[PDB]
């Protein structure tokens, strides 16, 4: 009641060393801005959000609890998605039970790394208000669309075996009987990585920075063994006009171990 919550700040470090985005309702405008902020520890509305801002990248300006306001936030491929919904309530101190569908309002191209967020609240000392936070996960859902196009119900397949039986049949209705369900599943609870004990870096300098290179007709081959293939060291100095992988993706190279490695060297004219 009396709009205590005013907005959010999303950021990684929440200081001036990293960019952050502030979305607030300032009483006479909705303002969104993404800059390097000197965020205060206690951000509230009497406007004590930040001291100074520099290197700004994005800006957007607009033209007995009673009120429940619901939002969903996601971040993806440099886009922050916001979904919104509202419901009148009379519950005293709990989250009312029920079903409501949120609708998109914002798709912002910020291109920042978000690991943390903090809410912005007014101080009067302070009025009674509550907010609630939950976390999202990849899941399969079955949605029911009505004749007008409204989503009025849904089924979460992972909740229990009956919900999966429903999702498998594609029905909210099930007749009496016994049905065969998927086999018992177990989810992993640990991570194991086993690699050989190697303490030496591969000889990039000797191969690439060799004083003399042979003729193509008399090409030379050299064995490579017992070494750590980092190749990020080359980023500082050595650069290649041609780099092509055939049987392997370039992205997977860092996570692999290689057997029977050989390197062949020669010199040709550009056209060849």
């Amino acid at each position: 009641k009396s709009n205590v919550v005013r907005g959010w700040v999303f950021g990684s470090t929440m200081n001036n060393k990293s960019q952050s985005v502030i979305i607030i309702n300032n009483s006479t405008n909705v303002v969104i801005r993404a800059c390097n902020f000197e965020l205060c520890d206690n951000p509230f509305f009497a406007t004590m959000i930040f001291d100074n801002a520099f290197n700004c990248t994005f800006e957007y300006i607009s033209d007995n609890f009673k009120h429940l306001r619901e939002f969903v936030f996601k971040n993806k491929d440099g886009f922050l998605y916001v979904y919104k919904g509202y419901q009148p309530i009379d519950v005293v101190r709990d989250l009312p039970s029920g079903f409501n569908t949120l609708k998109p309002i914002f798709k912002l191209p910020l291109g920042i790394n978000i690991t943390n967020f903090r809410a912005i609240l007014t101080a009067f000392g302070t009025s009674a208000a509550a907010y609630f936070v939950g976390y999202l996960k990849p899941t399969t859902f079955m949605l029911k669309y009505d004749e007008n196009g409204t989503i009025t119900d849904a089924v979460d397949c992972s909740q229990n075996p009956l919900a999966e039986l429903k999702c498998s049949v594609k029905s909210f209705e099930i007749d009496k009987g016994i049905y065969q369900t998927s086999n018992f599943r177990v989810v992993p609870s640990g991570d194991v990585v086993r690699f050989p004990n190697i303490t030496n870096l591969c000889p990039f300098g000797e191969v690439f920075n060799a004083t003399k290179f042979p003729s193509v007709y008399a090409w030379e081959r050299k064995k490579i063994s017992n070494c750590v293939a980092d190749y990020s060291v080359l980023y500082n100095s050595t650069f290649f006009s041609t780099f092509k992988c055939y049987g392997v993706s370039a992205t997977k190279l860092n996570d692999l171990c290689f057997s029977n490695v050989y390197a062949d060297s020669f010199v040709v004219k550009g056209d060849d």
Binding site: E70, V72, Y83, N100, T101, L136, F141, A154
Partner: peptide, 14 residues
Amino acid sequence: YTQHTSSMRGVYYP
């Protein structure tokens, strides 16, 4: 810090 239940909240248009 109190723990509450989210019964069927959070569905949005895909």
